[PDB]
């Protein structure tokens, strides 16, 4: 797609894990705004950050993010394996539709 | 806000299909509908953001006059927690556009992240076969 990532990203559990997200001056950071979100296979998204690090509602401060001129970061401390599923990243302005990127997958290393 | 999607649908190809979804416990007409599909062979497509409250839409240029999008009148079920439903007509289907599709309520009234995708519904499957 015009949105990507790096498709997959790995750590251990009880660290912290980095995924970004890059594209083209079409979906340039410097301009629009970068959502994450939570899709699991086969059931619905969970929305994690709206706006580069502003954090939804009822998830746990262990979630947050920052945002570069040509990249959007999400970081994920202290992973659990719950955190397994695929994380998506979706570009936007107050009036424009969010562009969806491709998935990266988490690997929770260390499990029984 | 409890938003459930009708069921799915098994259409052939060029057949015309509505898919809806009705909420309960929330505003209808303060938030909006927002319809995406998740493709097999893509992964989330996106597919447009429809206000409830007026006419505005804004719907992907990958797929404008394809689809009609519409809402229906708010039902005043109590104050602050009505009822009501949504729903889009896709026409022409392609073997492509299969896959599960969703319907999500809208985060924010106001702010830069309005009309983004907040609660999504359990979906739907469609087949196209
Ligand atoms: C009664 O309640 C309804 C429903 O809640 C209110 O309608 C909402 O009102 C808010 C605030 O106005 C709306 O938010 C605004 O959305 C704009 C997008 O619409 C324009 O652009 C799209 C293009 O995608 C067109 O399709 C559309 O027709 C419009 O032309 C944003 O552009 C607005 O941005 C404002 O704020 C940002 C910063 O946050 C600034 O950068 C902008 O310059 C601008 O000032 C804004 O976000 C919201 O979309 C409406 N929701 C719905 C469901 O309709 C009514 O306003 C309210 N009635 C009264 C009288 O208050
Ligand atoms: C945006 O508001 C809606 C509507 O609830 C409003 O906020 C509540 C805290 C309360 O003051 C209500 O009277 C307001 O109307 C939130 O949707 C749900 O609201 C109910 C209210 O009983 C609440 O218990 C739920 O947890 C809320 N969340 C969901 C997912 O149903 C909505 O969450 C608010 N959005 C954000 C981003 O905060």
């Known amino acids: 797609s015009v949105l990507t990532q790096s498709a997959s990203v790995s750590g251990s559990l009880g660290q912290s894990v980095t995924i970004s997200c890059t594209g083209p001056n079409s979906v340039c950071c410097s301009h629009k705004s970068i959502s994450w979100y939570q899709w699991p296979p086969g059931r619905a998204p969970t929305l994690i950050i709206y706006e580069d690090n502003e954090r939804a509602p009822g998830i746990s401060p262990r979630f947050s993010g920052y945002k570069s001129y040509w990249s959007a970061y999400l970081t994920i401390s202290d992973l659990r394996p719950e955190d397994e599923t695929t994380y998506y990243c979706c570009s936007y302005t107050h009036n424009s539709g969010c562009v969806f990127g491709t998935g990266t997958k988490v690997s929770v290393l260390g499990q029984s | 806000g409890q938003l459930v999607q009708s069921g799915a649908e098994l259409k052939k190809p060029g057949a015309s299909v509505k898919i809806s979804c009705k909420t309960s416990?929330?505003?209808?007409?303060?938030?909006?509908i927002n319809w995406i599909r998740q493709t097999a062979g893509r992964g989330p497509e996106w597919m447009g953001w429809?206000?409830?409250?007026?006419?505005?839409?804004?719907?992907?240029?990958?797929?404008?006059?394809r689809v009609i999008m519409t809402t229906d009148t708010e039902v005043p079920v109590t104050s602050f927690t009505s009822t009501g439903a949504a729903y889009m007509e896709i026409r022409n289907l392609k073997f492509d556009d299969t896959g599960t599709y969703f319907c999500?309520?809208?985060?924010?009234?106001?702010?830069?992240?309005?009309?983004?995708?907040?609660?999504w519904g359990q979906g739907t499957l469609l087949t196209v076969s």
């Open positions: 429809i206000s409830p409250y007026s006419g505005d839409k804004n719907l992907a240029p990958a797929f404008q006059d």
């Open positions: 999500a309520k809208g985060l924010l009234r106001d702010g830069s992240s309005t009309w983004l995708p907040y609660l």
């Open positions: 416990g929330y505003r209808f007409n303060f938030y909006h």
